[PDB]
Amino acid sequence: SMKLLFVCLGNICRSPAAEAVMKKVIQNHHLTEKYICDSAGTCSYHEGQQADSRMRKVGKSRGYQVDSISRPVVSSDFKNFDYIFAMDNDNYYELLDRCPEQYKQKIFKMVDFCTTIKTTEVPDPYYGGEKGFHRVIDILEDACENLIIKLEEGKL
Ligand code: NA
Known part of the structure; x- marks a missing residue:
């Protein structure tokens, strides 16, 4: 029924x-x-x-x-x-650049659902070590938990 799309750059690490x-x-x-x-x-x-x-x-x-x-x-x-969720600002503006005006309201920054971790983005971990990958999971666990609540409360 409700369909959620998560978007990064390469679709190999973050999304x-x-x-x-x-x-x-x-x-x-x-x-x-x-x-x-x-x-x-x-x-x-x-x-x-x-x-x-x-x-x-x-x-x-x-x-x-x-x-x-x-x-x-x-x-x-x-x-x-x-709904469509961008991992970082680059992804967000790329999506918006390509999105028809009537669907632009579907697009959100993933991090705008964080309630615990203060971060401006889900950082690209590709060129770092394992800690960067854990960091991505940390941010997603925060944001995704709050996201399901907002969706079920109908807040979007
Ligand atoms: Na796929």
Whole structure:
């Protein structure tokens, strides 16, 4: 029914983890029948690629199944998804640049649902160490938990 799209740049680190974390939060709240999650990237360079092995490893250690095949955002995503969540500001403006005016209200910064971690973005962990991957999960656990609450309260 309600369809949620999580968007980063490559759809190999951040947004696959966002999808996995959000799926878990939804399952925890017994709302699996009501929500569908997906992820995509603003860029198609990595299209067809498995999630980054480090994110899969860190994901698993944190209790998540990170399992995605990278895909680019397509124009129909703006129509077909109910809400779209950008991992960082770059993703956010890219999405808005491509989004028809009538669907722009669907697009949010992931971090605008953080209530604990003070951060301006879900930082790209690709060129750092394992700590950067954990940081992404930290931010997602904060934001995704508050997001499910806002969705169920109808606050969007
Ligand atoms: Na995919």
